[PDB]
Design an enzyme around this catalytic site. Structure first.
Site, short mmCIF file in Angstrom:
data_model
loop_
_atom_site.label_atom_id
_atom_site.label_comp_id
_atom_site.label_asym_id
_atom_site.label_seq_id
_atom_site.Cartn_x
_atom_site.Cartn_y
_atom_site.Cartn_z
N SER A 1 0.84 -1.18 0.00
CA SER A 1 0.00 0.00 0.00
C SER A 1 0.88 1.23 0.00
O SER A 1 2.04 1.15 0.37
CB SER A 1 -0.96 0.01 1.20
OG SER A 1 -0.28 0.31 2.41
N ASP B 1 7.48 7.58 -13.29
CA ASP B 1 7.93 7.10 -11.96
C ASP B 1 8.75 5.82 -12.07
O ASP B 1 8.53 4.86 -11.33
CB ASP B 1 6.72 6.93 -11.02
CG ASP B 1 7.11 6.93 -9.52
OD1 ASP B 1 8.22 7.39 -9.14
OD2 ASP B 1 6.29 6.42 -8.73
N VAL C 1 -2.88 -2.83 -2.86
CA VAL C 1 -2.81 -3.94 -3.81
C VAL C 1 -2.87 -5.25 -3.06
O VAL C 1 -2.05 -5.47 -2.16
CB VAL C 1 -1.49 -3.93 -4.67
CG1 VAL C 1 -1.51 -5.07 -5.72
CG2 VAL C 1 -1.28 -2.58 -5.37
#
Ligand SMILES: NCCCNc1nc(-c2ccccc2O)nc2ccccc12
Ligand SMILES: [Ca+2]
Ligand SMILES: [Cl-]
Ligand SMILES: [Cl-]
Length: 266
Positions: A10, A128, A16
């Protein structure tokens, strides 16, 4: 439709979970994000940008985790994502094993470049790229990019917004709040490659980013150092193109993914 297993992680991206699709027992990952925690939205009909970007890259095969399905709830969106087993993210892999041998880093870095070029060809900028956003399929030796939640449609004009990881962001972002897509991607790839061969990132503070002086704390070959310092050029226009990275002498004779898993991961 899905049997929900343990929480896998998380953070900024939401939560997830591991999961199984009930119909055929397919392993999946199930990611929840609150609507109020989403800032960037797009259209296919109104969805998170993340969904738009994932649909654009989930066509065919690649080193990108594929979006399988998504649901809208009253206060959240749920994404159903592909899940290799066993898998470990590159951050955990590096934490666990330290600096990577160059042969292994070459193989991993090459697959990241192939995956990033695929995104770009599909009109998607990740924004990212980092160890935590790279999954290793440990049996096949294949890497997969995840977390398009800070991404954008790729364009040739200037970005003035950024919400990825600051220590992977380029000096032109730090100083000016302006960067172009591909040359900022290449900067982050230089950070990543340093991280693979040294076991940690080269810069922690803004002033270190801005200065851009690279110190190698581990034994690294001259060709690898050269590629790293090239990717980390202070002026965006001094950085290599993707083609120049992949033609670099350090990148020649890469292992196949299965060779990589057999030599390094088994
Ligand atoms: N830093 C890694 C986070 C936890 N693990 C995982 N995270 C994500 C994931 C994390 C953030 C955003 C999108 C994503 O698809 N997707 C996964 C897909 C399959 C297996 C694991 C996964
Ligand atoms: Ca060295
Ligand atoms: Cl959330
Ligand atoms: Cl930032």
């Amino acid at each position: 439709q899905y049997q929900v297993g343990p929480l896998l992680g998380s953070g900024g991206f939401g939560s997830v979970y591991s999961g199984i699709r009930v119909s055929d027992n397919l392993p999946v990952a199930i990611k929840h994000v609150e609507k109020d925690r989403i800032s960037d939205w797009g259209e296919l009909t109104r969805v998170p940008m993340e969904v738009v970007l994932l649909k654009k890259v989930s066509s065919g095969f690649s080193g990108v985790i594929r979006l399988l399905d998504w649901f809208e709830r009253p206060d959240s969106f749920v994404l159903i994502l592909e899940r290799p087993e066993p898998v470990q993210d590159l951050f955990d892999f590096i934490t666990e094993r330290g600096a990577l041998q160059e042969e292994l880093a070459r193989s991993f870095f090459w697959q990241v470049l192939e995956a990033v070029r695929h995104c770009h060809n599909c009109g998607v900028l990740h924004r990212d790229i980092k160890d935590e956003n790279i999954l290793i399929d440990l049996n096949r030796g294949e890497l997969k990019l995840i977390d398009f939640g800070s991404g954008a449609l790729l364009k040739d004009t200037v970005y003035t917004d950024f919400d990825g990881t600051r220590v992977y962001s380029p000096p032109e972002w730090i100083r000016y709040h302006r960067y172009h897509g591909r040359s900022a991607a290449v900067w982050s790839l230089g950070i990543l490659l340093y991280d693979m061969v040294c076991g940690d990132i080269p810069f922690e503070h803004d002033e270190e980013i801005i200065r851009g002086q690279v110190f190698f704390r581990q034994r690294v070959s001259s060709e690898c150092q050269h590629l790293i310092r090239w990717c980390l050029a202070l002026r965006p226009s001094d950085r290599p193109t993707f083609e120049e990275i992949q033609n670099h002498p350090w990148m020649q004779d890469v292992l196949l993914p299965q060779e990589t898993a057999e030599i390094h991961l088994h």
